[PDB]
Write an enzyme that holds these catalytic residues in place. Structure first.
Site, mmCIF file in Angstrom:
data_model
loop_
_atom_site.group_PDB
_atom_site.id
_atom_site.type_symbol
_atom_site.label_atom_id
_atom_site.label_comp_id
_atom_site.label_asym_id
_atom_site.label_seq_id
_atom_site.Cartn_x
_atom_site.Cartn_y
_atom_site.Cartn_z
ATOM 1 C CD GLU A 60 -2.408 1.908 1.966
ATOM 2 O OE1 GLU A 60 -1.714 2.940 1.787
ATOM 3 O OE2 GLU A 60 -3.186 1.753 2.943
ATOM 4 C CG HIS A 61 3.491 2.732 3.194
ATOM 5 N ND1 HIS A 61 2.488 2.215 3.977
ATOM 6 C CD2 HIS A 61 3.967 3.811 3.853
ATOM 7 C CE1 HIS A 61 2.363 2.948 5.064
ATOM 8 N NE2 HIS A 61 3.238 3.934 5.005
ATOM 9 C CD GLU A 137 2.483 5.533 7.760
ATOM 10 O OE1 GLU A 137 2.029 4.367 7.698
ATOM 11 O OE2 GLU A 137 2.676 6.255 6.744
#
Lengths: 446, 52, 105, 425, 57
Positions: A60-61, A137
């Protein structure tokens, strides 16, 4: 005049067509100048083993940081220049990539999505840059008491099953995940019969199907065979996780029983009861006059800063209950008042309050499906979880069915005399002992 | 008095009626067993053993 | 308006005088029993009325204790017994009755 | 075939008393009605600051036709919502429910706006909510900055505070709310917007219940721009800062030029976790700054003024470098270093962005209402896109020129040891 | 194009009967959590984000 029942019929049918490789292509055509196109993949963290728990989140990153056909900056520049917005998310069961764009920009939007989905250039220099970003994060997510408690709730409820895992993965997995680890996950999971190309807006369906054959064809030849990966069920455990931290100003509690899962018809009836209990927040105007008993007592006696009901759905399972944030001295009363509400509804639900719950739901369902992004999301998700798009008229039909007798029967099936999963964080000295919580799951009077 | 007369309360009574019936059964069989009330206990098969 | 309606009013003035709270300087609404509707009505009173109410109750409890009564001129006259709690108490009961009508359906 | 019904057009009507009625029959399962009022924070004066905030919080209090309890219970019974959304110029009372239930919510809507009672005890009970409401908003460092930005910029009306000043909490009186409604909630300051309602019905209720006179006239005392800087020593890890100059009033051709310049320099992100390659300000800062930062073009338009410039989030030490990189980037546009494709990209960002902003009924209704109040008309998306297109590259450069050379307004919070005064820019 | 949201800049507060309190339109923070170190202010006597009236069927 145009009545509410009549207006449900007016919304156009979601046109579903299947490609030769297994890619489901579905559209809801409307009049809008804009649209939302996306790919919904049946992949999350439930699909991941303990050794690759951060994978979906890592992909996703990387998904927007460059493809083989569009290296580095290229994807960003192309999407930005046409005014489009590019977004992604990953939950325990579903990964999604979607573009908010003008309807005339639909050809390009579909093309770009195909590149992200199939040709992700997982560059060695980038996966090294991304590991520092994800680690940051994780430190960021620690400060969100809400995100923590729900992660804990999954961890304790789904003890030693794929579902106990978080989407993000642990710190060890983020710093250890290799380039090969991610390609192996991508080849295993990003396969056509587990992908839905969903769209909503000013687009014809024929336009969309053309583009899917134009850009998504080339996932056939020969596929699956050797590795068929179907999800095994996840054992729910009545359990407690208590992270005592007296340095945090307010306590966070998430309490849930095992829910039935996406497909089950009585998710509608549970949601009506969850509406009757509802949600609260210290900024709500209502105060003492609020319909919901829990909400009204909570405002009057300043019993919390907020609460919310939930019905989290997974394949064949889920979490059903409430979360609240309150002062250190208010945890006991809050548990009591909530548990008593589950029990009131389980034994003695009434016709009027059930109509209100039905009405809140009708309103929740219609207010949610407003504009291309919510509808496109509903198309992608529903095709993965229900197999079809359930039309609004049918939802109404299934809502209208739910009388008081339904609520107390369905509530009893799931709530009455069951072991909850309890997650607690913060100043939790006053949080009830598990046995006492368990005791609040039944009434001696009934 | 007049405040408890309405559709919800009729529903609330109907909801608690099987429960209030079953507590009556608990009370009765409870009283019958605790006093050894012969009038009622003469009817039950295995408990019958008290031949004068 | 009527000869016999002046008589109901004179019998009411008789009872008022027989009740004798006016002898302790009290107004009728001072003497009300404090229930939940009443407590709220007192709560809803403006500053000047609440403060006067407090003093009148204070004065009468003081007289009660010393077993005295006020001089005749200082008794609350039936004609000028200001029913200050009336609109407040009527509004609280109005609000309660609505809640109760709502709790019925 | 899976085609939709042919879309109906918006029906617009200016009543002779000044009141505007707009409606769109979209055939939606739910309905949305908004009463938009020229009653925002800018109509408060020094003697009654925060009155429009308490009023915003007061939508659920006893009215002549419906008690506090009735409004709450009656709306919830049908699963409806009642929301009041203030800005510096406007107050919008938006009601929302399924289409069978409009009549009930309309009655509630009309009561809240045209027959509130502001009961002494009810108002006293609500005062503590101003503290709660403010505390929750002010936990965004941006809120206090944009509040300080407006207090520094204007001497006058737009300088007003949106959230009630602390000293006025517990001090705003029932009479002040009565006076605020009597002289701002009038026909000529109002617009009734409907969605999922027929025009004859909305026109009916407006002619029956919304014919109110005896208020104030124009768009208040003309907002006088002043300039200056407000500084807040915070100890807040990062420094939030906003540089701004006077721009253009909403609706004017110049306003559109500022909106294009905003998209040239860079507004919000477009890609989830992105370097923002087309963001002129972001790239300009990133060249010189390597730590965590953010920068965006700030664009605020009002009835009689505007504020354009930029907003920065940076590490305390990096503050001066981020603001100076950002400012110099604007300076190059003012000097004439702007290409035609550059403007085209910004144009597409603004066009599509606007179109996306009115996609939902929540966003569509808010736009029609704001239009009705600001312009006295409805302007279709196709013609807004025409006005956006009309902006020449020179107009964008001139908008930059205007900012660089105009008296500045600044607001900053954090550890300001390395945050520059206007003096030093 | 006349709106606070459509011009994206100045602040817009929202109160309601049933839904959570909202603050403001545009200025940066979404491209500030991507250079990730923004810890986001704690629940120190505070409400809830994301609102609640988006519940699926």
């Amino acid at each position: 005049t145009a009545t509410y029942a009549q207006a449900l019929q007016s919304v156009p049918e979601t046109q579903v067509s299947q490609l030769d490789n297994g890619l489901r292509v579905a559209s809801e055509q409307s009049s809008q100048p804009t649209c939302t196109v996306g790919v919904w993949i049946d992949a999350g963290s439930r699909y991941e083993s303990e050794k690759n728990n951060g994978a979906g989140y890592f992909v996703e990153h990387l998904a927007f940081k460059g493809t083989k056909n569009r290296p580095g900056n290229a994807l960003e520049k192309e999407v930005e220049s046409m005014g489009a917005h590019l977004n992604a998310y990953s939950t325990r069961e579903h990964t999604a990539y979607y573009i908010k764009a003008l309807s005339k920009d639909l050809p390009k939007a579909v093309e770009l999505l195909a590149d992200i989905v199939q040709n992700c250039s997982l560059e060695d220099s980038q996966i090294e840059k991304e590991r520092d970003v994800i680690l940051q994060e994780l430190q960021e997510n620690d400060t969100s008491m809400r995100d923590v408690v729900f992660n804990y709730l999954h961890a304790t409820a789904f003890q030693g099953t794929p579902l106990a895992q978080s989407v993000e993965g642990p710190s060890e997995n983020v710093r250890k995940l290799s380039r090969a680890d991610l390609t192996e996950y991508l080849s295993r999971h990003y396969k056509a019969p587990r992908m839905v190309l969903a769209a909503a807006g000013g687009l014809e369906h024929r336009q969309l199907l053309d583009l899917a054959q134009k850009h998504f064809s080339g996932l056939s030849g020969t596929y699956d065979e050797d590795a068929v990966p179907t999800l095994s069920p996840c054992r729910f455990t009545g359990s407690q996780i208590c992270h005592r931290e007296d340095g945090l100003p307010l306590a966070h509690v998430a309490i849930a029983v095992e829910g039935p899962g996406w497909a089950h018809p009585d998710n509608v009836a549970l949601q009506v009861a969850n509406a009757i209990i509802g949600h609260y927040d210290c900024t709500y105007g209502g105060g003492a006059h609020l319909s919901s008993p829990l909400a009204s007592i909570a405002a009057t006696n300043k019993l919390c800063q907020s609460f919310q009901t939930f019905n989290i759905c997974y394949a064949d399972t889920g979490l059903l209950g409430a979360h609240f944030v309150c002062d250190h001295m208010s945890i006991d009363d809050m548990m009591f008042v909530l548990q008593g509400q589950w029990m009131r509804l389980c034994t003695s639900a009434t016709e009027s309050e059930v109509l209100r719950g039905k009405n809140l739901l009708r309103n929740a369902l219609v207010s949610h499906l407003d504009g291309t992004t919510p509808v496109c999301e509903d198309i992608g998700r529903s095709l993965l979880t229900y197999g079809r798009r359930i039309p609004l008229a049918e939802w109404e039909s299934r809502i209208a069915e739910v009388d008081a007798r339904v609520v107390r029967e369905v509530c009893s099936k799931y709530f009455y005399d069951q072991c909850p999963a309890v997650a607690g964080f913060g100043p939790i000295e006053q949080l009830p002992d598990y046995n006492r919580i368990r005791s609040g799951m039944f009434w001696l009077r009934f | 008095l007049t405040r408890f007369l309405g559709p919800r309360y009729r529903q609330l009574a109907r909801n608690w009626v099987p429960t209030a019936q079953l507590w009556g059964a608990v009370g009765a069989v409870g009283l019958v067993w605790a006093t050894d009330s012969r009038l009622i206990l003469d009817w039950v098969p295995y408990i019958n053993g008290k031949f004068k | 308006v009527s000869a016999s309606s002046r008589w109901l009013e004179g019998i009411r003035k008789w009872y008022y005088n027989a009740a004798g709270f006016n002898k302790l300087g009290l107004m009728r609404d001072d003497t009300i029993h404090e229930n939940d509707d009443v407590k709220e009505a007192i709560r809803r009173l403006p500053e000047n009325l609440y403060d006067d109410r407090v003093f009148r109750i204070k004065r009468a409890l003081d007289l009660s204790m010393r077993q005295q009564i006020l001089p005749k001129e200082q008794w609350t006259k039936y004609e000028e017994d200001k029913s200050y709690l009336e609109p407040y108490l009527k509004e609280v009961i109005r609000e309660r009755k609505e809640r109760e009508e709502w709790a019925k359906k | 075939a899976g085609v939709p019904p042919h879309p109906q057009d918006l029906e617009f009507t200016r009543l002779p008393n000044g009141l505007v009625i707009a409606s769109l029959e979209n055939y939606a399962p739910a309905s949305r009605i908004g009463l938009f009022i020229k009653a925002g924070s800018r109509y408060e004066n020094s003697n009654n600051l925060g009155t429009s905030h308490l009023l915003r919080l007061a939508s659920s209090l006893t009215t002549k036709g419906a008690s506090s309890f009735k409004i709450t219970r009656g709306i919830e019974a049908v699963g409806g919502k009642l929301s009041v959304t203030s800005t510096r110029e406007n107050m919008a009372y938006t009601v929302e429910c399924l289409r069978d239930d409009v009549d009930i919510l309309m009655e509630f809507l009309l009561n809240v706006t045209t027959a509130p009672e502001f009961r002494r005890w009810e108002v006293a009970a609500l005062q503590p909510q101003l503290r709660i409401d403010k505390a929750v908003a002010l936990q965004n460092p941006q809120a206090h900055v944009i509040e300080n930005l407006h207090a520094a910029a204007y001497r006058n009306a737009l300088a007003n505070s949106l959230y009630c000043p602390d000293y006025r909490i517990g001090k705003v009186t029932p009479v002040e709310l009565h006076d605020y409604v009597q002289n701002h909630f009038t026909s000529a300051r109002m617009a009734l917007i409907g969605l999922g309602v027929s025009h004859p019905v909305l026109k009916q209720v407006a002619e029956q219940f919304l014919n109110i006179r005896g208020g104030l006239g124009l768009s208040g005392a003309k907002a006088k721009y002043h300039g200056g800087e407000i500084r807040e020593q915070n100890g807040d890890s990062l420094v939030h800062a906003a540089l701004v100059a006077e721009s253009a009033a909403i609706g004017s051709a110049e306003a559109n030029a500022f909106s294009v310049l905003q998209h040239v320099l860079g507004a919000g992100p477009h890609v989830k976790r992105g370097s923002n390659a087309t963001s002129s300000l972001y790239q300009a800062v990133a060249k010189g700054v390597h730590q965590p930062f953010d920068v965006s073009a700030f664009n605020a338009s009002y009835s009689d003024s505007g504020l354009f410039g930029f907003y920065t989030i940076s590490q305390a030490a990096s503050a001066g470098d981020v603001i100076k990189a950002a400012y110099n980037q604007v300076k190059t546009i003012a000097q004439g270093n702007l290409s035609n494709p550059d403007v085209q990209a910004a144009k597409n960002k603004l066009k599509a962005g606007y179109l996306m902003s009115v996609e939902s009924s929540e966003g569509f209704l808010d736009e029609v209402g704001s239009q009705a109040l600001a312009a006295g008309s409805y302007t279709p998306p196709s013609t807004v896109l025409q006005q956006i297109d009309a902006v020449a590259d020179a107009d964008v450069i001139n908008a930059a020129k205007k900012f660089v050379s105009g008296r500045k307004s600044m607001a900053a919070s954090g550890n300001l040891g390395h945050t520059p005064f206007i003096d030093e820019l | 194009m006349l709106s606070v949201a459509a011009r994206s800049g100045p602040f817009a507060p929202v109160l309601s009967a049933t839904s959570r309190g909202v603050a403001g339109a545009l200025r940066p923070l979404v491209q500030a959590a991507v250079p990730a170190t923004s810890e986001s202010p704690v629940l120190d006597l505070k409400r809830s984000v994301l609102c609640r009236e988006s519940l699926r069927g």
